[PDB]
């Protein structure tokens, strides 16, 4: 709990490491949860934008009080935490899929064997 700067070093990070990670947790969190809204057995991309401009397509519930849903890039550390605190509460309703969206199956990757 001391003032410092960011850089390549956990010792320096601290406040960043917390955010960096959180960002991942939140992101994945939504991605994962979202899957349910798509009955997907994996975390899918969460178009916060679309949901923003209009949830109609994909909705988001469980959100905490006095907290707005959005990408973890804008959300703050504390912000993320909350969401996480309600990770179990988080929810996503797919009223209507996007014009091109896809469900079921898996994307195309290529880590090694693929």
Swiss-Prot record:
Organism, scientific name: Homo sapiens
Subcellular location: Cytoplasm; Nucleus
Function of the molecule: Interacts with the basal transcription machinery by coordinating the formation of a multiprotein complex at the C-FOS promoter, and linking specific signal responsive activator complexes. Promotes the formation of stable high-order complexes of SRF and PHOX1 and interacts cooperatively with PHOX1 to promote serum-inducible transcription of a reporter gene deriven by the C-FOS serum response element (SRE). Acts as a coregulator for USF1 by binding independently two promoter elements, a pyrimidine-rich initiator (Inr) and an upstream E-box.
GTF2I-like repeat feature ranges: 13-107
Protein name per its UniProtKB record: General transcription factor II-I
PTM: Transiently phosphorylated on tyrosine residues by BTK in response to B-cell receptor stimulation. Sumoylated.
Assembly and oligomerization: Homodimer (Potential). Interacts with SRF and PHOX1. Binds a pyrimidine-rich initiator (Inr) and a recognition site (E-box) for upstream stimulatory factor 1 (USF1). Associates with the PH domain of Bruton's tyrosine kinase (BTK). May be a component of a BHC histone deacetylase complex that contains HDAC1, HDAC2, HMG20B/BRAF35, KDM1A, RCOR1/CoREST, PHF21A/BHC80, ZMYM2, ZNF217, ZMYM3, GSE1 and GTF2I. Interacts with BTK and ARID3A. Interacts with isoform beta of PRKG1. Interacts with GPR50 (C-TERMINAL DOMAIN).
Cross-link Glycyl lysine isopeptide (Lys-Gly) (interchain with G-Cter in SUMO2), where in sequence: 15, 18, 33, 45
Disulfide cysteine pairs (residue numbers): none
């Amino acid at each position: 709990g001391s003032s410092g700067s960011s850089g390549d070093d956990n010792e320096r990070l601290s406040k960043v490491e917390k955010a960096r990670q959180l960002r991942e947790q939140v992101n994945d969190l939504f991605s994962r949860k979202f899957g349910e809204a798509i009955g997907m057995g994996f975390p899918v991309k969460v178009p916060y934008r679309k949901i923003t401009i209009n949830p109609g397509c994909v909705v988001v519930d469980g959100m905490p009080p006095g907290v707005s849903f959005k990408a973890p890039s804008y959300l703050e550390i504390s912000s993320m935490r909350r969401i996480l605190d309600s990770a179990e509460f988080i929810k996503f309703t797919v009223i209507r899929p996007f014009p091109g969206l896809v469900i079921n199956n898996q994307l195309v990757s290529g880590p090694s064997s693929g």
